[PDB]
C-alpha cells in the first residue's frame, strides 16, 4: 500500500537485501537494524516498521 501512504520509500537493492534478511527471520535485532541501516544507508525506524509490515502480510489471523 505505497500509493496512499508515503513512507516506504525504498530501493530494489534495499528492499532486495531487507528480503533476504526477512526470509531467514520475520524478525530483526538490535544490531541488525542498525547494521541494515548503517549498511544500506536508512532509518532504524524505517527498517523495523518495513519488518513489522512484512510480517504482518503472513500472519493475518
Given at each position: 500500500?505505497?500509493?496512499?501512504?508515503?513512507?516506504?520509500?525504498?530501493?530494489?537493492?534495499?528492499?532486495?537485501?531487507?528480503?533476504?534478511?526477512?526470509?531467514?527471520?520475520?524478525?530483526l535485532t538490535e544490531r541488525?537494524?542498525?547494521?541494515?541501516?548503517?549498511?544500506?544507508?536508512?532509518?532504524?525506524?524505517?527498517?523495523?516498521?518495513?519488518?513489522?509490515?512484512?510480517?504482518?502480510?503472513?500472519?493475518?489471523?
Amino acid at each position: 500500500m505505497d500509493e496512499k501512504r508515503p513512507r516506504t520509500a525504498f530501493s530494489s537493492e534495499q528492499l532486495a537485501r531487507l528480503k533476504r534478511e526477512f526470509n531467514e527471520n520475520r524478525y530483526l535485532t538490535e544490531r541488525r537494524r542498525q547494521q541494515l541501516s548503517s549498511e544500506l544507508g536508512l532509518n532504524e525506524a524505517q527498517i523495523k516498521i518495513w519488518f513489522q509490515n512484512k510480517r504482518a502480510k503472513i500472519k493475518k489471523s
